């Protein structure tokens, strides 16, 4: 199916991503949702016209994968809202929520079938609100939804020097996973022990340890580890990826890209072993406004006066103002694989490669 394009366009995107997130993030986690984004960004793409459309068709790798109602897209709009539906299903010891919302500016009327297209294809996913003259009472009402959305744990996403009078689009995206281990760590075996940030910096961690059969690509010549760690339910797995030295992660966030994981998780590659586990118990909350990124990214005209959203709104000026993206990913419980240092990690969506979420543990 086409769904393997939207699959490589995502993670292609992810590490276009990754490489302008990491310029900023230096020395600190990172955790996003490439997925979370792209859909939020297609459903503003399904509006947009002109230079900021072609940007925007470029910069997510559209352009890789009789007109229609909803535009030329509408199979790849289609195809993100069956993935979506499915990954966000919540079943037994499983939640994963996608909070994601365009909101605009109530004096610029949308158009009745960009409207039509959102409930159709993004449901829920567009407000009008006054930004106007209530900007302020906007911000918390968008934050507390965001809040709500993410069980309290995404927090303040649009600070207040974010929203004004004149703001007419904000993009909001969050995204939220608690997930618990296929097999149960054992609670009396986790236990405190030092994570090595550096060979010179320790910190304590309360490590998780499991001793199970585990898919695991042992690559020596990349000095890197790679583990497969599937979920309790859902169809969800976890990888990660261990540099063999204590501070290999820099070597190896130079090099990847979307071709190179490819390559690294190749089932060809991938080994059911004996593997005994130590993984850092992990709860991460990242924000990240990613207008400059998107902007650097390519999609310069959507964040300036000159934005193209004719297919959103006939009015005068409308651009988006902020992009917003919160994330966050809670997990709650031979060969070694002890991941003790900086490490690279992703969820991925089993059934059809697609990477929800993608990051970097650098410190407990
Ligand atoms: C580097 O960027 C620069 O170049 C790129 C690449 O373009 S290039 O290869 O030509 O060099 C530019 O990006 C491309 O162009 C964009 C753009 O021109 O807006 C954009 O194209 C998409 O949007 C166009 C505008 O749509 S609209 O709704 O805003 O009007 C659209 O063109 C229009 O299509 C409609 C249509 O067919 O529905 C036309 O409407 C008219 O025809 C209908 C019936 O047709 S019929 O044959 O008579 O029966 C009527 O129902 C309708 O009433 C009627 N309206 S009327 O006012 O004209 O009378 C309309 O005339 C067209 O203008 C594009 O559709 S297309 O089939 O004509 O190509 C649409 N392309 S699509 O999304 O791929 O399907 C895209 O971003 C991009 O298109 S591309 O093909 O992907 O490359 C970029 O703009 C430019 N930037 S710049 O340098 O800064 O300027």
Redesign the pocket.
Request: hydrophobic share 5%; glycine share 18%.
């Given at each position: 199916f086409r769904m393997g394009s939207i699959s490589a366009a995502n993670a292609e995107f992810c590490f276009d991503v990754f490489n302008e997130l990491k310029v900023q993030h230096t020395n600190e986690n990172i955790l996003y949702s490439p997925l979370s984004i792209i859909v939020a960004l297609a459903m503003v793409y399904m509006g947009?016209?002109?230079?900021?459309?072609?940007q925007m068709?470029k910069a997510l790798h559209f352009?890789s994968i009789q007109?229609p109602k909803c535009?030329?897209?509408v199979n790849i709009h289609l195809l993100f809202k069956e993935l979506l539906s499915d990954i966000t299903a919540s079943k037994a010891n499983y939640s994963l929520r996608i909070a994601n919302r365009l909101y605009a500016e109530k004096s610029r009327p949308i158009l009745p079938i960009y409207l039509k297209c959102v409930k159709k294809l993004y449901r829920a996913g567009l407000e009008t609100v006054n930004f106007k003259t209530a900007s302020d009472q906007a911000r918390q009402l968008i934050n507390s939804w965001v809040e709500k959305q993410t069980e309290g744990q995404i927090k303040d996403l649009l600070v207040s020097s974010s929203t004004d009078l004149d703001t007419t689009l904000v993009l909001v995206n969050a995204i939220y996973f608690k997930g618990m281990w296929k097999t149960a760590f054992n609670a009396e075996d986790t236990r405190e022990m030092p994570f090595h940030v550096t060979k010179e910096e320790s910190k304590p961690v309360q490590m998780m340890c499991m001793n199970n059969s585990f898919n695991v690509a042992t690559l020596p010549a990349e000095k890197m580890k790679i583990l497969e760690l599937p979920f309790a339910s859902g169809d969800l797995s976890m990888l990660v990826l261990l540099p063999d030295e204590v501070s290999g992660l820099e070597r190896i966030e130079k090099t990847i890209n979307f071709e190179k994981l490819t390559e690294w998780t190749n089932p060809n590659t991938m080994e059911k072993r004996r593997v005994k586990v130590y993984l850092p118990q992990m709860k991460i909350e990242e924000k990240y406004n990613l207008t400059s990124v998107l902007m650097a990214l390519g999609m310069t005209d959507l964040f300036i006066p000159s934005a193209?959203l004719?297919?959103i709104s006939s009015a005068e000026s409308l651009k988006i103002s902020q992009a917003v993206h919160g994330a966050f990913m809670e997990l709650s419980e031979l060969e070694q694989f002890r991941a003790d240092h900086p490490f690279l990690f992703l969820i991925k969506h089993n059934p059809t490669n697609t990477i929800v979420y993608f990051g970097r543990y650098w410190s407990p």
């Open positions: 947009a016209r002109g230079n900021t459309e072609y068709e352009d007109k535009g030329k897209s193209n004719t297919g």
